[model samples]
Target: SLYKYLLLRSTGDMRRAKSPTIMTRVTNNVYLGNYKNAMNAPSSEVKFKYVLNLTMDKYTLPNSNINIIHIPLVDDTTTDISKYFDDVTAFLSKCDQRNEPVLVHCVAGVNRSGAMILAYLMSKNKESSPMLYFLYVYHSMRDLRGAFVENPSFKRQIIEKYV
Candidate 1:
């Protein structure tokens, strides 16, 4: 179902280059990850509401005109994952009503960023499912940010939770 080369490569212990190209070709790729942001980056300079690092409480932001939609997606158990959806939806609804440009972020600006962006896009497109919407973003932004969806199974799990 996937290319052999797409197997996840990890930096092993002691940072040693392991031999044999250790591979799993795993079908279960449900990824739960995080996003990080740079401290000096300006929030509004990018036009989109910029992703801010959750760790930072204050910074000299470059763009003063943009409004921030701070949706903090923590690395918590599945019990509260639904809260993320409600929180994100509420922000999107508010932004849509105001016709505002939104920049979303969670630490590192990868996992949570990808999730939120895809969620908003799916909502805007009136998509009834999350499969394709997430796949599109994951494929396009894979290089821009190290995302979690490297396999179909992983994508399905995330979609099941949000959609």
Candidate 2:
């Protein structure tokens, strides 16, 4: 068993390193970011209305022109993340009406933020089952941003809630 596991590890794609850009535009006004490119970054020069911070880390950001909606959660998967979706949709709907940008970020923008933005993208499509759009949006965003929702539990919960 150990040698089987070892062989499997050694025989694959050999670990291509993932380096997601600081900010990758998922849509016209929706962006995904990490700590490096998030709202806490330098100068507040980015034109984002809602920086939907999804990480549990406390940031040192003074209030700026941007409206912050911090929904703190760990990188783990147990949290009922969808509980906040309705409120998020409400505010984000307001932003959408105003044509404002919404940036979702976590520590590396891979798991937590990925889940959030993935849901956002899925939400944009009405009259479609989550079964149809879930994986489609997942790979589409990964193609645009790289290294998307890699947590199994989060993926399960997303499908459950969205479906």
Candidate 3:
């Protein structure tokens, strides 16, 4: 079976793209679909475990022992990620304590999502330099979303406050 949702962007200034997404859990796996073409394959091909319409502000999809954390970067003002940081910490801690793979994403699978992932990795690494920590995620996710973290204050927040 497939679980589908329309992630409507609460703010119109973000983007013109409204993604129709699909998510599925099968064979102990999870997959997300960006387009209808992604659904044609048989159940054997679980390409992604979950998909977002790009409009959703935030959502969490837990898959078995793993989970997906989705967050959108909307305004130039920094969001209070403190709460989310705690939730992610608790969830990831539990998962790590049990050993699992979690997939976290944003509208284009970058930017805000990348930041959260960065925070998580920083939390885990504990000793890595925060200056260039996000480089690896940017390279891996190919996310080009511009963000306010370019602000020195935001950078300080991540390094000094979160991690």
Candidate 4:
């Protein structure tokens, strides 16, 4: 099933050239990955029980059993991914508390969707000043999920939201 969807549902050569990385666990049940990782969930091992689809790309989850939280957005720097930080924290916080496995994903899992994870993580550390703590969290997130939340606007929102 994994190999079957790769070429056929890989979004053509763009996918061929840019194969998505496997899903990575960021915190308790909170996973991070790209769009193909979300689409490939049913076929692959159930690393996440739900999907936080942050991209506007159409998915091929024809008969998916997983619950999807569709908060779609583009990767533009001007897009207010900040506005959704509270909602993202609210949803992800409940999932973590309930021990539910959830995956956060965008097209490349590098900008928008990944930003949600940063916000959620920062929410857990709201007591500390984000001015200093954000650096640690951002670096930790990058260490786990490679480069993410590269959009400067998104980073600013994460800091200000917690500040």
lDDT of each: 0.41, 0.72, 0.39, 0.74
Q: Tens digits of per-residue lDDT for model 2 on 1-163?
A: 6445435543662344375786887777777788777755435555777788887865655756676678896677676777766676666666777888888788888888888777776778787666656756765566567677878787887787787
As for lDDT, the candidate ahead, 2 or 4, is 4
How does candidate 3 fare on TM-score? 0.45
Candidate 1: regions farther than 4 A off: 1-71, 76-79, 127-130, 144-157
1-163, model 3: which lDDT tens digit per residue?
Answer: 1111111211232332233243322113222233242223223243333332222554333332222344444423455544566565555555555444333444443334444555656666555455444444322222223331233433454566543
Score candidate 4 by TM-score against the native: 0.79
In the range 1-163, model 1's lDDT, one tens digit per residue, is 2222123222221222221111111112111123323332243232344332333344345545333334444443342334455556566656556544444544544444445555555555564445545544445455334343233433444577655
Candidate 1, clashing residue pairs? 35-107, 35-108, 35-109, 36-107, 36-108, 36-109, 37-108, 49-102, 49-103
Q: Model 3 lDDT vs. the true structure?
A: 0.39
List, residue by residue over 1-163, the lDDT tens digit for candidate 4: 5344333433442221233377877787788888778878777665456888887854656777788878878787776777798888898999888888888898888887778888887788847666556766665566556576778888787777786
Better of 1 and 4 by TM-score: 4
Q: Give the CA lDDT, 0 to 100, for residue 54 in model 2.
A: 81
Best by lDDT: 4
In model 3, state the lDDT of residue 74: 49
Regions of candidate 3 where Cα sits further than 4 Å from its true position = 1-75, 127-156
For lDDT, candidate 2 versus 3, the one ahead is 2
For TM-score, the strongest prediction is 4
What's the TM-score of every candidate structure?
A: 0.50, 0.77, 0.45, 0.79
Model 2, residue 30: C-alpha shift (Å): 1.9
Clashing pairs in 2: none
Alpha-carbon runs more than 4 Å astray in model 2: 1-17, 39-46, 127-129
